[PDB]
Swiss-Prot record, chain A:
Expression across tissues: Ubiquitously expressed.
HEAT repeat segments: 41-78, 86-123, 185-223
PTM summary: Myristoylated.
Quaternary data: Component of the PI3K (PI3KC3/PI3K-III/class III phosphatidylinositol 3-kinase) complex the core of which is composed of the catalytic subunit PIK3C3, the regulatory subunit PIK3R4 and BECN1 associating with additional regulatory/auxiliary subunits to form alternative complex forms. Alternative complex forms containing a fourth regulatory subunit in a mutually exclusive manner are PI3K complex I (PI3KC3-C1) containing ATG14, and PI3K complex II (PI3KC3-C2) containing UVRAG.
Modification Phosphoserine, positions: S421, S426
Subcellular location: Late endosome; Cytoplasmic vesicle, Autophagosome; Membrane
Stretch of the intact protein here: 373 to 965 of 1358
Function recorded in the entry: Regulatory subunit of the PI3K complex that mediates formation of phosphatidylinositol 3-phosphate; different complex forms are believed to play a role in multiple membrane trafficking pathways: PI3KC3-C1 is involved in initiation of autophagosomes and PI3KC3-C2 in maturation of autophagosomes and endocytosis. Involved in regulation of degradative endocytic trafficking and cytokinesis, probably in the context of PI3KC3-C2.
Family: Belongs to the protein kinase superfamily. Ser/Thr protein kinase family.
Entry protein name: Phosphoinositide 3-kinase regulatory subunit 4
UniProtKB/Swiss-Prot annotation, chain B:
Domain of life: Eukaryota
Protein known as: Beclin-1-C 37 kDa
Location within or outside the cell: Mitochondrion
Effect of substituting D12A: Abolishes in vitro cleavage by CASP3 and CASP8
Organism encoding this protein: Homo sapiens (Human)
Lineage: Eukaryota, Metazoa, Chordata, Craniata, Vertebrata
Stretch of the intact protein here: 138 to 200 of 450
UniProtKB/Swiss-Prot annotation, chain C:
Boundaries of the shown chain within the full protein: 5 to 543 of 887
Organism: Homo sapiens
EC nos: 2.7.1.137
Top-rank lineage group of the source organism: Eukaryota
Signal peptide: none
UniProt keyword annotations, A-Z: ATP-binding, Autophagy, Cell cycle, Cell division, Cytoplasmic vesicle, Endosome, Kinase, Lipid metabolism, Manganese, Nucleotide-binding, Phosphoprotein, Transferase, Ubl conjugation
Residues modified as Phosphothreonine: T159
Protein name: Phosphatidylinositol 3-kinase catalytic subunit type 3
Curated annotation (Swiss-Prot), chain D:
Signal peptide positions on this chain: none
Subcellular location: Cytoplasm; Endoplasmic reticulum membrane; Preautophagosomal structure membrane; Cytoplasmic vesicle, Autophagosome membrane
Higher taxonomy: Eukaryota, Metazoa, Chordata, Craniata, Vertebrata
Domain notes: The coiled-coil domain is required for BECN1- and PIK3C3-binding and for autophagy. The final 80 residues in the C-terminus define a minimum required region for autophagosome binding called BATS.
UniProt similarity note: Belongs to the ATG14 family.
Residues of the full protein shown: 56 to 148 of 492
Reported modifications of this chain: Ubiquitinated via 'Lys-6', 'Lys-11' and 'Lys-63'-linked polyubiquitin chains on multiple lysines by MARCHF7, leading to ATG14 aggregation and loss of interaction with STX17.
Its job: Required for both basal and inducible autophagy. Determines the localization of the autophagy-specific PI3-kinase complex PI3KC3-C1. Plays a role in autophagosome formation and MAP1LC3/LC3 conjugation to phosphatidylethanolamine. Promotes BECN1 translocation from the trans-Golgi network to autophagosomes. Enhances PIK3C3 activity in a BECN1-dependent manner. Essential for the autophagy-dependent phosphorylation of BECN1. Stimulates the phosphorylation of BECN1, but suppresses the phosphorylation PIK3C3 by AMPK.
Spans traversing the lipid bilayer: none
Biological source species: Homo sapiens (Human)
Protein name, UniProt field: Beclin 1-associated autophagy-related key regulator
Segments forming a coiled coil: 16-93
């Protein structure tokens, strides 16, 4: 039990630590002892010093102080008589500045942990309620104060100037934080914030992260989310970055498995996704197989043949039923559009008239028109010549025409990003400069642990300089 | 007043859609009745011949 | 001739890494495994010579990920896995510790919904002596495993060596950079030898490599190496080499007791502001509070009592004497409590002049509680303030001397004494002698000259306040002279 | 709220004369036929479903014969190469 005596020699140092290494060491020490220390020692003694480090001058330490505080507080299985208020009155207001910290790593470390602080505080209030009942606070107005206090922070992180913080909140716990918003406000303020991430037309990782996490929030909001979210999923399938499409297809897969897509929209999405079964990108191709097999498993086998097969038969080799098994459908997919043919079509300046010409050739191919003239604008004939001379088979023309809507929308969106490429024209190059930020350079003539390492580096550079200088002169 | 007119249209469209789906099932039945002509015996026997071949190739694999 | 560098803590910009190409044959599994699990047939390994791989780039440290894994945007491949994408990593150079690592996993498709790793490579962002990776690097990709960022890394992308090509490639790059002495006749032979060695390694082994590149930060045509460094790592500890009075140094000597500070905020919660108008102490706490209010003016309350005097501060408001205790519970450093104390002070049934003398004593220095004392000391006869005047002239020692020297809740204590003196000549008589004793006190003139000069300015003020009085008052100035 | 309970409401524009209750009844009847058509389709499905299982079995087996034939080719070419290597190594030895 002597740990209480040891913790006193540790804690007596935590206010005078100068170096970052010792401050970080002190946080490991606390975390290593914390499971052994009694609840009273964690909240009364240890906690005041964890909050102290959250104000430290080193951002790594502020980050690790919150990261330790969350893990330490998660250990408190009981509530001291005098600490029932620690979360509303001491912990949360004491770290609330981190959620708006200057250093990204701190806000980032806040986003990674707020999903757990909130849940710990809620479970703490739960224990307080059980304590009051077993002993015999206005739970309703305390819980709502915790919610209003959590919601204010979530909305702050979703409004962070650096997308990585939003993206980090998405992956770490937005599905659980929804409880702090409740069924209604999760839609009004939380979901409406996430829907805004798809307006970022230059950070595809944020649009990706939207589709990764949106399934959780949509499942929570329930039926209300379908009509609001439906058009955003169709945009995702038409995105400018194909990995966002893969993530959009994955979202629709998971949403169909949860029964969140209303029955008419399920078939509607299958009509839009079936063309992807011949897309050259295997990630999209098997993404479509994912979604469309999930559909075949959610719907009745009567609808599989009567409603799903008509959308799928143009890309299937044989109209096999029991496509509900992913192995079956992969085995019967037609060969995809070769990536070369796909790029020449998609990348063309005016893809509209290209498809119009190809669509007219389809009519001539299927007997629905008598004969077809050559294209009118030579740029279309030049493209037609390129495509056909590159081995474009007639089946690839039919498949390209099925991908018509995707390629058209996607090409239009890719262009719209190029219309923003002027804003980042400087970063695309291989070089970045200090001149913009005015950072003071440091130099040494070649003719603490950090300070010693730098001396060793300088010594190595003087030696490696003389080595090349001498050898060159000697030759 | 406006809600009444709107709800009447929502039912009229629901009716027309549900009716169309019923016509779709009918059309599918008109196709399934023709697919019933497919023989099961010849197909199943082809599986037996292929299963015999696999038994040969799997033994040769062990060898 | 010069080495240019910057500290990793000064460069507050996002780290950026180019995912280059992936070189090397990819081991195809024998069809025996394809028979074990048929979904292998649809993996990217079997469908196309180059699959549309992607590279994840998590920055690890101490075996923990520093941030979310950035990833290469989709690029189609036909005959060469080549990305030319600068991943803007999610961490900045000051966020990186000395053991920061990039964990570059290469991924491929494995049927629907499931990626599988082609291989992984982990390279520390800081070299042998803390300099950040300066340029192009070829990292050995450990096959079929996800890149591990634990320390030590089980899938290191680099070696300290221990094989021919890892040494010969470093020398080849050094030779290309011009670091190595050029000799055309040797080079034309040694590189054929290295070609034979590499082509042998490419056959006898199936290792693959991932090219990566780090941005060479530039300024005014100089390229700065980034050196791992820490703000405050620049100062050596000022440990004193000898001691003879303080044998047992204590690092928490004059630091704030954070545990006590934590107990303040919880026990004396202001959020009860709306509840405390309704909720009031019950039978068992009434007796207890009455006992506390009865305490002598010198009995410093224990934290249990100070707690109870705050929890029901809105109840005690109805008692004149209880205000003497409340003003001792309030911490006068904390602007939070002070802003509520000065509020409830203005709501409290006011204390009597007996109690008002307490607020003037040394312990109280917040101007609004000193001025409030005067705001009740005013409500007493000049007959009484004539007797207390001997003490009150000493309470000026506890008064803000800056308001005196420039005074040449309406009134501070000195202004109130001078005011009430002009209003009644009996006070003005004694007020002259009391203050002039201090001005003649040659001990104060040497032991605490600041207090001595305060009385001198009190006398200059009184000298002037009489001259600014009525004709009948001005005569008192000449009478005292 | 009194309108929906009466069932007497119709378009104010006079676009139609059949009451909402008449249309709701017709929808229930259409849904009834939807059940009938699905139950009629499913009895046809129970036939095709069996033959398509067989078709998938044949196609799976053919995909496995293609695999095994290649596996034997691979195994033979590896063995042939190893035999030629062994012979050369014995000669060298």
């Amino acid at each position: 039990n002597g740990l209480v005596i040891l913790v006193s020699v540790i804690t007596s140092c935590l206010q005078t630590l100068k170096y970052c290494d010792s401050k970080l060491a002190a946080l490991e020490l606390i975390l290593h002892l914390a499971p052994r220390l009694s609840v009273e020692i964690l909240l009364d003694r240890i906690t005041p010093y964890l909050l102290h480090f959250s104000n430290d001058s080193v951002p790594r330490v502020r980050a690790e102080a919150l990261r330790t505080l969350t893990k330490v507080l998660a250990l408190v299985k009981e509530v001291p008589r005098n600490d029932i208020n620690i979360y509303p009155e001491y912990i949360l207001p004491g770290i609330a500045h981190l959620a708006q910290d200057d250093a990204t790593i701190v806000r980032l470390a806040y986003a990674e942990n707020i999903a757990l602080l909130a849940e710990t505080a809620l479970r703490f209030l739960e224990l307080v309620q059980l304590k009051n009942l077993n002993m015999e606070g206005n739970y309703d107005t305390e819980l709502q104060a915790l919610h209003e206090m959590v919601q204010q922070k979530v909305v702050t992180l979703l409004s962070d100037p650096e997308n990585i913080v939003k993206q980090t909140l998405m992956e770490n716990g937005i599905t659980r934080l929804c409880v702090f918003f409740g069924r209604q406000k999760a839609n009004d303020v939380l979901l409406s914030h996430m829907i805004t991430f798809l307006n970022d037309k230059n950070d595809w990782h944020l649009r990706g992260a939207f589709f990764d996490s949106i399934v959780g929030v949509a499942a929570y909001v329930g039926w209300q989310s379908s009509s609001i979210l439906k058009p955003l999923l169709q945009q995702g399938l038409s995105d400018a970055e194909e990995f966002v499409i893969v993530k959009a297809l994955y979202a629709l897969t998971c949403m169909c498995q949860l029964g969140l897509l209303q029955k008419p929209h399920v078939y509607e999405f299958a009509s839009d996704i079936a063309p992807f079964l011949c897309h050259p990108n295997l990630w999209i191709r098997y993404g479509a197989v994912g979604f469309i097999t999930v559909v075949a498993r959610q719907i009745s086998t009567a609808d599989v043949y009567c409603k799903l097969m008509p959308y799928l038969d143009p890309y299937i080799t044989q109209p096999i039923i029991q496509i509900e098994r992913k192995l079956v459908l992969l085995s019967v997919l037609k060969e995809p559009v070769s990536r070369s043919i796909f790029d020449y079509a998609l990348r063309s300046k005016d893809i509209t008239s290209l498809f119009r010409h190809l669509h007219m050739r389809q009519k001539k191919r299927n007997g629905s028109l008598p004969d077809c003239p050559p294209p009118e604008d030579p740029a279309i004939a030049q493209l037609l010549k390129k495509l056909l001379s590159q081995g474009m088979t007639e089946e690839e023309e039919d498949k390209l025409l099925a991908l018509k809507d995707f390629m058209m929308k996607s090409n239009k969106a890719k262009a719209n990003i190029v219309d923003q490429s002027h804003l980042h024209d400087s970063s695309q190059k291989g070089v970045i400069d200090l001149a913009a930020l005015g950072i003071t350079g440091r130099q040494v003539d070649l003719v603490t642990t950090c300070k010693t390492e730098l001396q060793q580096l300088i010594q190595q550079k003087r030696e490696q300089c003389n080595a090349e200088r001498i050898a060159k002169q000697m030759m | 007043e406006e809600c009444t007119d709107t709800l009447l249209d929502q039912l009229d469209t629901q009716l027309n859609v549900t009716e169309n789906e019923c016509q779709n099932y009918k059309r599918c039945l008109e196709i399934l009745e023709q697919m019933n002509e497919d023989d099961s015996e010849q197909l199943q026997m082809e599986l037996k011949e292929l299963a015999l071949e696999e038994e040969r190739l799997i033994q040769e694999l062990e060898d | 001739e010069k080495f240019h560098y910057i500290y990793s803590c000064d460069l507050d910009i996002n780290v950026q890494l180019k995912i280059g190409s992936l070189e090397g044959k990819r081991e195809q599994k024998s069809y025996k495994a394809v028979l074990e699990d048929p979904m292998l047939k649809f993996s990217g390994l079997y469908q196309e010579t180059c699959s549309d791989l992607y590279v994840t780039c998590q920055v690890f440290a101490e075996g923990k990920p520093l941030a979310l894994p950035v990833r290469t945007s989709y690029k189609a491949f036909s005959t060469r896995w080549n990305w030319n994408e600068w991943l803007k990593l999610p961490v900045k150079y000051p966020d990186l510790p000395r053991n920061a690592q990039v964990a570059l996993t290469i991924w491929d498709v494995y049927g629907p919904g499931k990626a599988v790793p082609v291989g992984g490579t982990t390279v520390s962002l800081f070299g042998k002596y803390g300099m950040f990776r300066q340029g192009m690097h070829d990292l050995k990709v450990w096959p079929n495993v996800e890149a591990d960022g634990s320390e030590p890394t089980k899938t290191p992308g680099r070696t300290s060596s221990e094989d021919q090509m890892s040494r010969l490639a470093k020398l080849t790059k050094a030779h290309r950079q011009g670091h190595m002495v050029k000799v055309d006749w040797l080079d034309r032979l040694t590189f054929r030898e290295i070609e034979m060695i590499n082509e042998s390694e490419k056959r006898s082994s199936n290792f693959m490599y991932l090219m990566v590149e780090f941005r060479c930060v530039k300024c005014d045509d100089k390229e700065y190496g980034i050196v791992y460094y820490e703000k405050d790592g620049d100062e050596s500890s000022p440990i004193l080499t000898s001691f003879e009075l303080v044998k047992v140094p204590d690092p928490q000597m004059s630091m704030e007791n954070l545990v006590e500070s934590k107990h303040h905020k919880l026990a004396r919660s202001l959020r009860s502001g709306p509840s405390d108008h309704d909720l009031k102490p019950n039978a068992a706490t009434r007796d207890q509070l009455n006992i506390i209010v009865s305490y002598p003016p010198t009995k410093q309350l224990t934290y249990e009592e100070q707690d109870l005097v705050w929890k029901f501060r809105y109840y005690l408001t109805n008692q004149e004497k209880a205000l003497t205790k409340f003003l001792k519970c309030v911490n006068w450093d904390l602007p939070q409590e002070a802003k509520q104390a000065l509020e409830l002070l203005g709501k409290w049934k006011p204390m009597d002049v007996e109690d008002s003398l307490e607020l003037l004593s040394s312990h109280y220095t917040n101007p609004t509680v000193r001025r409030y004392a005067v705001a009740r000391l005013r409500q007493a006869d000049d007959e009484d303030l004539l007797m207390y005047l001997l003490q009150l002239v000493q309470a000026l020692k506890y008064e803000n001397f800056d308001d005196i020297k420039n005074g040449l809740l309406e009134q501070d204590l000195c202004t109130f004494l001078i005011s009430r003196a002009c209003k009644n000549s009996t006070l003005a008589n004694y007020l002259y002698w009391y203050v002039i004793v201090e001005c003649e006190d040659q001990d104060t003139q040497q032991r605490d000259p600041k207090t001595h000069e305060m009385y001198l300015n009190v006398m200059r003020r009184f000298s002037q306040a009489l001259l600014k009085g009525d004709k009948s008052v001005r005569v008192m100035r000449s009478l005292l002279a | 709220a009194k309108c929906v309970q009466s069932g007497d409401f119709v378009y104010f524009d006079g676009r139609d004369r059949e009451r909402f209750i008449d249309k709701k009844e017709r929808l229930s009847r259409l849904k009834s036929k939807q059940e009938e058509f699905q139950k009629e389709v499913l009895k046809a499905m129970e036939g095709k479903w069996i033959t398509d299982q067989l078709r998938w079995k044949i196609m799976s087996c053919k995909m496995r014969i293609e695999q095994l034939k290649q596996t034997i080719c691979k195994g033979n070419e590896e063995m042939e190469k190893n035999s030629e290597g062994l012979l050369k190594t014995k000669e060298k030895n």
